Design a protein around this motif. Structure first.
Motif, PDB file in Angstrom:
ATOM      1  N   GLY A 105       0.805  -1.247   0.000  1.00 44.93           N
ATOM      2  CA  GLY A 105       0.000   0.000   0.000  1.00 44.93           C
ATOM      3  C   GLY A 105       0.824   1.278   0.000  1.00 44.93           C
ATOM      4  N   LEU A 106       0.130   2.395  -0.179  1.00 46.57           N
ATOM      5  CA  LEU A 106       0.759   3.689  -0.320  1.00 46.57           C
ATOM      6  C   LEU A 106       1.412   4.214   0.963  1.00 46.57           C
ATOM      7  CD1 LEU A 106      -1.869   5.527  -2.542  1.00 46.57           C
ATOM      8  CD2 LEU A 106       0.444   4.835  -3.216  1.00 46.57           C
TER       9      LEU A 106
ATOM     10  N   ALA B  82     -13.944   3.262  11.255  1.00 40.66           N
ATOM     11  CA  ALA B  82     -13.672   4.141  10.120  1.00 40.66           C
ATOM     12  C   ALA B  82     -13.387   3.370   8.828  1.00 40.66           C
ATOM     13  CB  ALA B  82     -12.516   5.068  10.430  1.00 40.66           C
ATOM     14  N   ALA B  83     -12.667   2.250   8.944  1.00 40.10           N
ATOM     15  CA  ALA B  83     -12.415   1.389   7.798  1.00 40.10           C
ATOM     16  C   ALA B  83     -13.697   0.706   7.354  1.00 40.10           C
ATOM     17  CB  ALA B  83     -11.348   0.358   8.116  1.00 40.10           C
ATOM     18  N   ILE B  84     -14.408   0.090   8.306  1.00 43.94           N
ATOM     19  CA  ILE B  84     -15.667  -0.598   8.009  1.00 43.94           C
ATOM     20  C   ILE B  84     -16.690   0.353   7.386  1.00 43.94           C
ATOM     21  CG2 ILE B  84     -17.700  -1.714   9.070  1.00 43.94           C
ATOM     22  CD1 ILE B  84     -15.690  -3.217  10.874  1.00 43.94           C
TER      23      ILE B  84
ATOM     24  N   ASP C  17      -5.415   0.556  -0.072  1.00 41.80           N
ATOM     25  CA  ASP C  17      -4.805   1.820   0.360  1.00 41.80           C
ATOM     26  C   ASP C  17      -5.507   2.490   1.537  1.00 41.80           C
ATOM     27  OD1 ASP C  17      -2.702   1.572  -1.400  1.00 41.80           O
ATOM     28  OD2 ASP C  17      -3.620   2.788  -2.983  1.00 41.80           O
ATOM     29  N   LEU C  18      -6.839   2.468   1.603  1.00 43.29           N
ATOM     30  CA  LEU C  18      -7.525   3.117   2.729  1.00 43.29           C
ATOM     31  C   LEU C  18      -7.346   2.331   4.035  1.00 43.29           C
ATOM     32  CD1 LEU C  18     -10.621   2.233   4.052  1.00 43.29           C
ATOM     33  CD2 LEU C  18     -11.221   2.571   1.645  1.00 43.29           C
TER      34      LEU C  18
ATOM     35  N   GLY D  86     -12.181  -6.150   2.805  1.00 45.59           N
ATOM     36  CA  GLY D  86     -11.281  -6.104   3.936  1.00 45.59           C
ATOM     37  C   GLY D  86      -9.884  -5.696   3.547  1.00 45.59           C
ATOM     38  N   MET D  87      -9.025  -5.591   4.549  1.00 50.40           N
ATOM     39  CA  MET D  87      -7.645  -5.214   4.326  1.00 50.40           C
ATOM     40  C   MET D  87      -6.871  -6.376   3.718  1.00 50.40           C
ATOM     41  SD  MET D  87      -5.972  -5.213   8.132  1.00 50.40           S
ATOM     42  CE  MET D  87      -7.319  -4.238   8.782  1.00 50.40           C
TER      43      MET D  87
END
Ligand SMILES: *[C@@H]1O[C@H](CO)[C@@H](O[C@@H]2O[C@H](CO)[C@@H](O[C@@H]3O[C@H](CO)[C@@H](O)[C@H](O)[C@@H]3O)[C@H](O)[C@H]2NC(C)=O)[C@H](O)[C@H]1NC(C)=O
Ligand SMILES: *[C@@H]1O[C@H](CO)[C@@H](O[C@@H]2O[C@H](CO)[C@@H](O[C@@H]3O[C@H](CO)[C@@H](O)[C@H](O)[C@@H]3O)[C@H](O)[C@H]2NC(C)=O)[C@H](O)[C@H]1NC(C)=O
Ligand SMILES: CC(=O)N[C@H]1[C@H]([C@H](O)[C@H](O)CO)O[C@@](O[C@@H]2[C@@H](O)[C@H](O)O[C@H](CO)[C@@H]2O)(C(=O)O)C[C@@H]1O
Ligand SMILES: *[C@@H]1O[C@H](CO)[C@@H](O[C@@H]2O[C@H](CO)[C@@H](O)[C@H](O)[C@H]2NC(C)=O)[C@H](O)[C@H]1NC(C)=O
Ligand code: NAG
Lengths: 172, 321
Positions: A1-2, A43-45, A109-110, B311-312
């Motif tokens: 990722g970034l 926040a991710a969810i 990335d997020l 998901g991640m």
């Protein structure tokens, strides 16, 4: 990722963390432990739910259309009917391929970004009382009992309380 | 004696491979399928009005082939044509069959209104053993086979104005005898003619005498034509032989009706989206079941699977195993 946290300076994820996506592990005088961070996890969810709901947004209702299978050879009109449908299908197939590729790069990335935000937030909380080891862990230079750890995790850690103790331990 | 505070993220034992800008396959914690690739194999009977044609094409139901009489005045959102359908009346062709089928399918009704045409000096209600209705000879219910009365067939010249506020669809035809003997025997004149016109347009068909392949006892044929008459216009029918006359008109509508070729059985369930393979759910944005669809449907694509990461990135702990 970034941002270089997930699959970067953090060596791996924790299969043991079943109650959150991001969180904390600690070692102190009283032992070891683990807790999920709810705010970063949510926040991710929330962002992922948001994109999922935008993607599955129903927009296509069609009734009478053109014929798409044919029992007779006809030539020009049928060539055109088939070419129109084949053209459409290819354009839609491309849109579908591109959409998932962009969505998925962005999701990776997020989620990497949220890890990094939590890490940077924690660093800033600890002011001069800790140092970044470079693997996602801070060395905290003072007596940080379980109540002190929880104070870091729920945003109530007063760095001034422990600064003198920590400054002394850091500079020899 | 200090303390260590480690930041981290979860991982799972069973991740999923997804595609990205930079990777054709890379592992994330979870993903969701965006392509609907399966069907129950059944057409749900709600919420659309499904009309099963059974043994009948829409055109045979329209013309009134006797074994399709059950379809008189029927309506539908989706007319379903089965591969077992058969014709069992006078053999016919429809120039531009596909257009007539389409415009009727899209209108969604076979509502028929009989009109009092006056056919002076001809015999009405002709029939044939090619088109049995009960034990005796018969014909398409919506058509009127006109032949000579005594030894004359006069120039027929009739009118029907449209004084309603809707469009009328008229189905009519022309008979093509197999031989010159048949032509003169039925219509007196050696060469017939049918001219059907409105103010705006006109169609003239000259019959062709000759054998076509024997079908259900006959080498002759009927050709089927149609004419739409708008409010304030007028139908005129002019013929000196070979007219297969309309008995009235079909009411035309506009709306959401269509037609589909499928052998899937109809079942009790609810589904907005119909394919020839059966109904499919429409919770996903894409589908690979069939390019032919009716209703609120995912868009057809060529891929059988596309995974949206939910998901991640899934990074397990390396092991010495
Ligand atoms: C990871 O993503 C998958 C999607 O690929 C999630 O699995 C899906 O979870 C939903 C909700 O639990 C399931 O729907 C439910 O199914 C039950 C029984 O079939 C039904 O009675 C409910 O009304 C509801 O519709 C869905 O079936 C399931 N997907 C598959 C393919 O079976 C999964 O929950 C996600 N994992 C995590 C940890 O979030
Ligand atoms: C075959 O049948 C048609 C349909 O009835 C006949 O057409 C009609 O012909 C008459 C004149 O012969 C037309 O009358 C005219 O109407 C206007 C007003 O619209 C009036 O002001 C004039 O004084 C005139 O009388 C009539 O409109 C017309 N009908 C239609 C529907 O167009 C035709 O004459 C018949 N031909 C034969 C050879 O039998
Ligand atoms: C209205 C009328 O004239 N009906 C006739 C019919 C037609 O003349 C014919 O279909 C025009 O092409 O013909 C019917 O009888 C036929 C015989 O003339 C023919 O030689 O043999 C056929 C049997 O193989 C056939 O039965 C008919 O179609 O039933 C008699 C009918 O009244
Ligand atoms: C839905 O039906 C379609 C159309 O019959 C199936 O695809 C066809 O399958 C035939 C017979 O196996 C193949 O020869 C062709 O490649 C396909 N025909 C066309 C016109 O595309 C399809 O597999 C079915 N799908 C499902 C999920 O049931
Ligand atoms: C079809 O509907 C029309 C108009 O309502 C009616 O006059 C006619 O008798 C109907 N016929 C049948 C068989 O339902």
């Amino acid at each position: 990722g970034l941002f270089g946290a997930i699959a970067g300076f953090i060596e791996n994820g924790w299969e043991g963390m079943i109650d959150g996506w991001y969180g904390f592990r600690h070692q102190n005088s009283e032992g070891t432990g683990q807790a999920a961070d709810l705010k970063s996890t949510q926040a991710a969810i929330d962002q992922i739910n948001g994109k999922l709901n935008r993607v599955i947004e129903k927009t296509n209702e069609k009734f009478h259309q053109i014929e798409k299978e044919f029992s007779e050879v006809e030539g020009r009109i049928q060539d055109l009917e088939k070419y129109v449908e084949d053209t459409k299908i290819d354009l839609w197939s491309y849109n579908a391929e591109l959409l998932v590729a962009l969505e998925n790069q962005h999701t990776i990335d997020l989620t990497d970004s949220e890890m990094n935000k939590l890490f940077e937030k924690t660093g800033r909380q600890l002011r001069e009382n800790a140092e970044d080891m470079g693997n996602g862990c801070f060395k905290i230079y003072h007596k940080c009992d379980n109540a002190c750890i929880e104070s870091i995790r729920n945003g109530t850690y007063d760095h001034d309380v422990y600064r003198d103790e920590a400054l002394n331990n850091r500079f020899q | 004696p200090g303390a260590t505070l480690c930041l981290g993220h979860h991982a799972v034992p069973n991740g999923t491979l997804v595609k990205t800008i930079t990777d054709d396959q890379i592992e994330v914690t979870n993903a969701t399928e965006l392509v609907q690739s399966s069907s129950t194999g059944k057409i749900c009977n709600n919420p659309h009005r499904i009309l099963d044609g059974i043994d009948c094409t829409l055109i045979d139901a329209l013309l009134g082939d006797p074994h399709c009489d059950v379809f008189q005045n029927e309506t539908w959102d989706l007319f379903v044509e089965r591969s077992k359908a058969f014709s069992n009346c006078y053999p016919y062709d429809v120039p531009d069959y596909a257009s007539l089928r389409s415009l009727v399918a899209s209108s969604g009704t076979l509502e028929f209104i009989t009109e009092g045409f006056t056919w002076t000096g001809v015999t009405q209600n002709g029939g044939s053993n090619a088109c049995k209705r009960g034990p005796g000879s018969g014909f398409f219910s919506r058509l009127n086979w006109l032949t000579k009365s005594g030894s004359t067939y006069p120039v027929l010249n009739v009118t029907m104005p449209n004084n309603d506020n809707f469009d009328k669809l008229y189905i009519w035809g022309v008979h093509h005898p197999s031989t010159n003997q048949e032509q003169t025997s039925l219509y007196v004149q050696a060469s017939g003619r049918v001219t059907v016109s409105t103010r705006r347009s006109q169609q003239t068909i000259i019959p062709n005498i000759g054998s076509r392949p024997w079908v259900r006892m006959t080498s002759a044929r009927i050709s089927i034509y149609w004419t739409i008459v708008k409010p304030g216009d007028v139908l005129v029918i002019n013929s000196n032989g070979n007219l297969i006359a309309p008995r009235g008109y079909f009411k035309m509508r506009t709306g959401k009706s269509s037609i589909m070729r499928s052998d899937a059985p109809i079942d009790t369930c609810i589904s907005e989206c119909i394919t020839p393979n059966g109904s499919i759910p429409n919770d996903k944005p894409f589908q690979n079941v069939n390019k032919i669809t009716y209703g609120a449907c995912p868009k057809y694509v060529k891929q059988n699977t596309l995974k949206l990461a939910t998901g991640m990135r899934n990074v397990p702990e390396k092991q010495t195993r």
